[PDB]
Design a protein around this nucleic acid. Structure first.
Ligand SMILES: [Mn+2]
Ligand SMILES: [Mn+2]
Length: 191
DNA sequence: GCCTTGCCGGGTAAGTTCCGGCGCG
DNA sequence: CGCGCCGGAACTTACCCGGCAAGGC
């Protein structure tokens, strides 16, 4: 559905390098935010924002994409109750993801949480269940993988993708054109 | 002798949650 | 009065990075 693939890719980025925030302020004021953070300005302005703006248009959400330059990172922010619950309800149903959504999400999550050298293929997160879900999808896609406690200091697990399956993982998941192609997958093959 | 990968420490690119503002019925 | 978009940025750590080495072929 392409809307579904982009949504799922975006959720991957959000759940990795952003978040979904229900805010209460004085009083009794509130706010609902959909957020992606990144150091890279290009990545946020040229790759992520156009994807988000498209999703906003098709959902007829009339909030704007904010870009705030913080001390350590840029924040792409959408202040929208509707978009907030759109991504939240999508997250609730994450185990129901079809194949295209699965691939797009994993794609998005790797851009956020992954080993970017590609010398190794690793996804970090403190959410073991999240990693396990991904792990099952990978297995079912013929991509072998293990999950371990990589960081004893902070409680961070890593999903390690077998180098024996480097090729399958990279061209099938990172270089798929069913979904938004990540920046140096769309550089990997116009090389 | 080369490769895969568990585990680890460094330190920054992430994430979370306050603030003040406005506009709406 | 009770909420929901805007604009910002202060506040801590969860990531990514890259080394080491045990194990395996
Ligand atoms: Mn994360
Ligand atoms: Mn990241």
């Amino acid at each position: 559905e392409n809307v579904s693939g982009i949504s799922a890719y975006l959720l991957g980025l959000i759940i990795g390098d952003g978040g979904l925030y229900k805010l209460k302020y004085k009083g009794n004021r509130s706010e609902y935010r959909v957020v992606i953070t990144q150091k890279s300005e290009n990545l946020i302005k040229q790759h992520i924002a156009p994807l988000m703006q498209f999703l906003i248009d098709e959902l007829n959400v009339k909030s704007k994409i904010q870009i705030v330059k913080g001390d350590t990172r840029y924040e792409l922010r959408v202040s929208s109750k509707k978009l907030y619950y759109y991504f939240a309800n999508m997250l609730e149903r994450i185990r129901l993801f079809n194949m295209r959504e699965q691939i797009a999400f994993i794609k998005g999550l790797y851009v956020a949480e992954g080993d970017k050298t590609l010398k190794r293929l690793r996804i970090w997160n403190k959410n073991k269940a999240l990693l396990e879900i991904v792990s099952r999808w990978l297995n079912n896609l013929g991509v072998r993988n293990t999950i371990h406690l990589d960081d004893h200091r902070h409680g961070v697990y890593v999903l390690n993708i077998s180098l024996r399956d480097r090729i399958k993982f990279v061209h099938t998941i990172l270089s798929s054109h069913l979904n938004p192609l990540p920046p140096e997958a769309a550089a990997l093959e116009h090389h």
